[PDB]
């Protein structure tokens, strides 16, 4: 999959494409409709399936700091776009171009001149051009006889509108199950593992892995979650008895340190039945279900007791998750008990 930053970077010799346009934050089940429709049509006519997306978030152009939290990083957006069969991602920066352009010149410049589009696919909520004047309707009118438009209704399922907004609200509430339901996969973050307390190994209280994330990263509410931890492919040695590319049952504590801001979130994972230290490795953490809210501990005894209940509850939740195997990892490690 190609990745182009700005119209100027798109190959001039590009001859034909089917194009979809959106922020696509989270690439949720609604987003997958647009992508699927686009990949289908590109296949039919032997064109390339192109996603036009936006970075920075279009909102943050007008309101820096008051931008929506990113359900996925841009990099993960790319990987997800690829995994659903996008051939090329064009990334538009509204501080560079396509901001003040009229709806007409937008179609002319982006869809025709830049992309050589024969088909365009948008959601019914799509807008474009200066002061968001252009709508799904405009696009259909301007594109008459020039290229075909397919406008897809927003996805409603089980009484919930599936959008980036709702996914963010679910995550913020700590309801990763409903977020996963809307995403069509386990919500996850990826990142390098750093040093924490310990000495991950024999000690049940020291995390198997510690990660930190900037405050633009959407993460579930502080608390403990059941999930899966996967060491990403690597040749580097692994301290302990965990193997790369296997999803390991884990109780996950999401926290907020600050006093400082960057209001930095931590993610601390206690991997069930394994003694490992993951420092320096790149690790994926998938969230499956909420287990409990955060609480303060006043003795090691109380703390470890609670830690043990987390593990028990996690084992239960994950044993269930494996049965919903469209969500579950291909290769996993979960012991029936301790």
């Amino acid at each position: 999959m190609d990745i182009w930053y700005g119209t100027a970077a798109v190959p001039k010799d590009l001859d034909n494409s089917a194009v979809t346009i959106g922020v696509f934050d989270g690439v949720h089940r609604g987003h997958q409709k647009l992508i699927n429709a686009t990949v289908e049509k590109a296949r039919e006519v032997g064109a390339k399936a192109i996603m036009v997306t936006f970075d920075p978030h279009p909102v943050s152009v007008f309101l820096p700091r008051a931008a929506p939290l990113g359900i996925t990083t841009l990099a993960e957006r790319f990987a997800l776009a690829e995994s659903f069969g996008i051939d090329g991602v064009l990334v538009i920066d509204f501080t560079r171009e396509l901001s003040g352009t009229s709806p007409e010149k937008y179609v002319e410049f982006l869809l025709e001149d830049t992309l050589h589009a024969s088909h365009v696919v948008v959601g019914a909520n799509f807008t474009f051009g200066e002061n968001a004047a252009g709508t799904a309707d405009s696009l259909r009118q301007i594109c008459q006889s020039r290229l075909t438009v397919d406008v897809i209704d927003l996805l409603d399922d089980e009484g919930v509108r599936i959008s980036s907004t709702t996914v963010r609200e679910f995550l913020s509430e700590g309801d990763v199950a409903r977020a996963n339901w809307a995403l069509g996969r386990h919500f996850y973050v990826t990142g390098p593992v750093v040093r924490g307390a310990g000495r991950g190994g024999k000690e049940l209280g020291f995390p198997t892995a510690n990660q930190y994330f900037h405050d633009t990263v959407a993460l579930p509410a502080d608390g403990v979650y059941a999930g899966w931890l996967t060491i990403l492919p690597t040749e580097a040695p692994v301290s302990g008895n965990m193997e790369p590319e296997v999803a390991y049952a884990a109780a996950i504590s999401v926290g907020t340190n600050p006093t400082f801001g960057d209001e930095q979130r931590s993610v601390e994972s206690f991997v069930l039945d394994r003694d490992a230290d993951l420092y320096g490795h790149d690790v994926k953490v998938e969230f499956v279900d909420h287990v409990r809210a955060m609480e303060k501990f006043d003795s090691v005894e109380q703390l470890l007791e609670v830690m043990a209940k987390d593990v028990q509850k996690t084992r239960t939740l994950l044993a269930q998750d494996v049965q919903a195997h469209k969500m579950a990892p291909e290769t996993y490690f979960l012991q029936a008990e301790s």
Copy 2:
């Protein structure tokens, strides 16, 4: 109008004065009674009307950081004092003088030796001297046969005591209309315009002007207000179609950035029907009415829609404000519609 910092700076040859004494923060309608009475009496006997005020705030001398927010800056206090006909402002710093003095020596030193007063005007809540021992009553007793005292009752109107305290509560609540009512004018801040997002001009989402204020500045609660933006007299060129000294209809967003403190407040003004960038200019922003609370936006479309409703509501509120012309600006710009 003269401005003197400390008793020592007052001209020795000053021969006669009518004096009023208070913090005078906000110079509200109650404060105007004291000032009016003082200016009247000074006119009668051909004396000078003197305001004795305090900086730093007397409270902050005992409780730094826990001082009341300043309804106006000291500089604006001066301008307002002048506008009601004060001839001289004496500024007392309680960390330098007049702090430990007995009520008797206070009258002797300040009113007689320093100011050569023949008339003094205070509010019924006035205190003075070490540990606030002296009252309106004391002042009348000590001044017997030495200079006349006029004690003015605190202003009650429509069931509300008009004081700095109540004005601050109204502002804090976001109720600028009642604050204006108590002030006897539109509450306003003044300050240099800096760079924000954009590029103020054709784009409706980029503010016409961005200003920042330190956290000692009283400002209304975060939200959107209808108000008027006036470029203060200047020879410097103005980017766009706004002229100096004209009050322009504006929707005003008051915000709080931090994470850092100084808990710095922002003020972002969207000037109705104008395309201008005000960087480097000195700008007055008068608040007229609350429009809505702050909210997070998840798409440019949603944001601009809301921005448009702000403008509609602002136009309505301001069209009304012009009719209460004792509050309204002399020269203004308000279009009937877009």
Copy 3:
């Protein structure tokens, strides 16, 4: 009293001891049972009474930053241990030793090899060894025929469990009276006096003393308390009419400054009927009773009036405290009135 940091620092020639083991934070009335039982038994057999305690807090080993607030500093723990007749304190750092040891090797290494114990005294909630496996029960089993164990039930009195946890909750609530009740003494902090506002002396609004404490220090909720201020023995001159080693009646304001963190707490003491400045001195502040919540002041007059009510209420509370003379200071200064 000896103080040893780590097992290695304990004299090899130590021949016999009676040992108690716990965090002992606050040395509350429950803690005093363990200490009393231990000192008694050590007296009987002519052994030394040894406290084994922990620093850092065992919780913070697993959860740094999320550690319980310290009811007393380590130094005060030592002084209190001494005052109840402990001969030696052994301080264990769980990041250095005794963390991963089995229950069996813990008894063998710590109680026998290191301490030459003939008697050990723990609370029924005691745990030890890797992953807190060992309990009061384990200890009794492992120690069979090797040294005697005495397990003391947790202290319940007036329907309240007396533990570090409950003391912390009382303090956090601002209920120092119940905290004192559980501690068996007035809760107190000690620290150097620094400069504040003023000029402690004739001015009633300037504190007699200002102290700051780091955010790991447990302190009552922000507000005003009645208490006693004692200048610790010193040869350094004292500005004003307070003498060293006398407990002086004081109204105490506990505050939180930040914006910055270290979320630093202040303690400002207004000593009744005295004019003194305590800069540079080391001062103990004992808390006796809650007087009022914190509030913002908008005039010096209002502030001083409230200050006067604080003093009146304090005089009342302290006059009562003197009658409960098991709590009260040996040598005190309290005037019947102003």
Copy 4:
């Protein structure tokens, strides 16, 4: 004078223009040659004189955290352009447009489509387009018989190249005399006066005015300088015996205070005033001495009386030579 942010803000009905192009930081004597040629030309052929300038600095596009110090603010650049009779300033942001463009397109789009220029004026060092391919030469042909180019050599005078760089060098070493000579005027900063050390009045040690400036602002080296302070036009009252729009003799101490951040403290000669809240312009005439620490009141006051005598002399000299002296000023011969 109009100010346009980006090509899109330019009036579509712009008939005809004479254009000059550059960063124009400082608007020094070399810059003034370009503007003069442009203004003289435009007034002749009926047309508007346009300056195309850049913000942020083209260097800062590639080297954030490594951009040259602003000799003047962008606001002062506008004011200086207007004073030399420019009719419109077009401000180009290289992160938005005109950056990755070819030389060929840059000309047609900017000079032709946007500005409809008959005449362009650039300095011999002018570069443009993608990776700065376009040069003083590129320009003269690419504009064949459409618009009349005019290249002006960089200014040498007294063996010295006059450029933004040399001005920045002169300032950096505290040689304000040479900076001014290159600028064609007193170097100045403008800013709101805040509270600082004590209160301005009878005391010689408390500054008449205190100002702070961000670290993007070029200031002379830390030290004391002779200069003039002006209260900008205002109806706000002035505490003390100073009125607006008169340049008052002052000794000026420039200090650094990390964490930015530069300070400017003005001791106005023979005045008792406190200028808190006013906007104030401070012009630098000549360097007086380096910064130094003090450990007694006597010593500090002694040196400050020397600063004052030194300032009187240097400023009296500035009044003769006359060319850069203020129109209305206040300078006493004696204390």
Copy 5:
């Protein structure tokens, strides 16, 4: 290769081992002699080759805020150990164990009880036990007929002592050639690429990749260097014309930005790419020039074209001599 944190993590059933002991920071040519002797020995006598190393640095135990810069991360130390055929790394933390121990106990506990070693290999400068009483000598006797000691002298070559210290010295002065010669390989750092100045593509001035490093990381002096950049194995897509696992010629600018903090910005020769989000390895070949400030686009681009020509030459040279050159690389002869 196994990694054990503390003596307690070592498999109790560890039959027999050949052990080497040291900080091993940088795993330089002197270090490689120790590992070689250890690995060759262990493969012979059926046994496992073990490295005992230290984290945190033994100096940092006594001098926090004053610890020497890490030539490599602990993670890279593991990777280097494994590449030279070490079977297990035992990481000792002196704040937890082995610190206040006598020389006598250190041997029995670590080499005997924990590691069950028949053979130990240390450098002639080896010290241990309480207050470093134990030395190269202490070791040879205390291990009498139990385990066969083997002391190796520090490496001198070309009149130069090869040690972590001299490597740190070479890096500090920007002499990467000498650092590499002492290391037996190109010095490198590895890190996630973040966003920085602009976007990597057609523009020569926007870096292909931007990385920041904490102040514990040894980096060469601020300046420009010739080097190779490798995208580490990945299935993530790559924006632009670069694939993973090929070393691409690059000019590398190393910068400092307080408050830590070092930056590494790579301008990959003859490529248009943006490597945001990828893990990237940057090897340093030779110093090109010191850091310098710029005040025009032309100037900055001019110097950067010089950096590129200079890099081509130096890297072509690195391809001959051959011994440290990358296996798979990309280097064009001409622009």
Copy 6:
């Protein structure tokens, strides 16, 4: 000894006094001449000896962020005044009073109305009143037949002017020997001991005591010094083999750690102790060596054993000459 903050705190019934006036920072040998003359005089004529001093420093009134470093704290200044037999200290804050006053009024108000002085003692460099008009001369007349003035010349000894300035110079360069000679005693700091590197005990590398000081506190240059450490009187238990009120030989490392901030770390010779929570006084005797970085445990311990031998010698020397040595001390001849 009484302490009065401001003229208003002085007992109205103050009958008669001999007064000395100055900053008195450090209370050095020059200062001691003033106090001696004042104390000897007052004990004679039945009266109280008064010191008028200043806080904040008179320089800091005009130059905030530029005030000279305190040779001692204000608290230590009180303690030193008392030790030389001053009966009352009057602390004047120039932001509150006595600042913009004329010379004439300063005398009548301070010396006459407030202090009711018969005798004043100042140094030949004394200045006062508005803009320091009043001088050693001004004083002798303005006090005509009311109160007997007495001016004392600044102390020269061994070709050296003894002043707060020269003391600050001596400290700054790390020459504590000369500072002490000028002070008439060992320079010292006093402070609460906190936790730092490791735990104080058997290990030579972990300091017996760790202290930090704000940047207003004058400390010797970064380096190692020979000195004495005293635990101030206390009933709090002491971990280890040290008792209060005995000066123990120590090697003292002074460090800087931005962002203030100075550190003082004491390695007490031949003791195993940890002094956390105690108030501790540290006296500086002689400079031993400059600061230096370490990169091995052996090296660091080696140098520290040298520091110890060096300290023993220097401190044994301090015990002879005798004049500044502590009354009760602990210094072993050998390890």
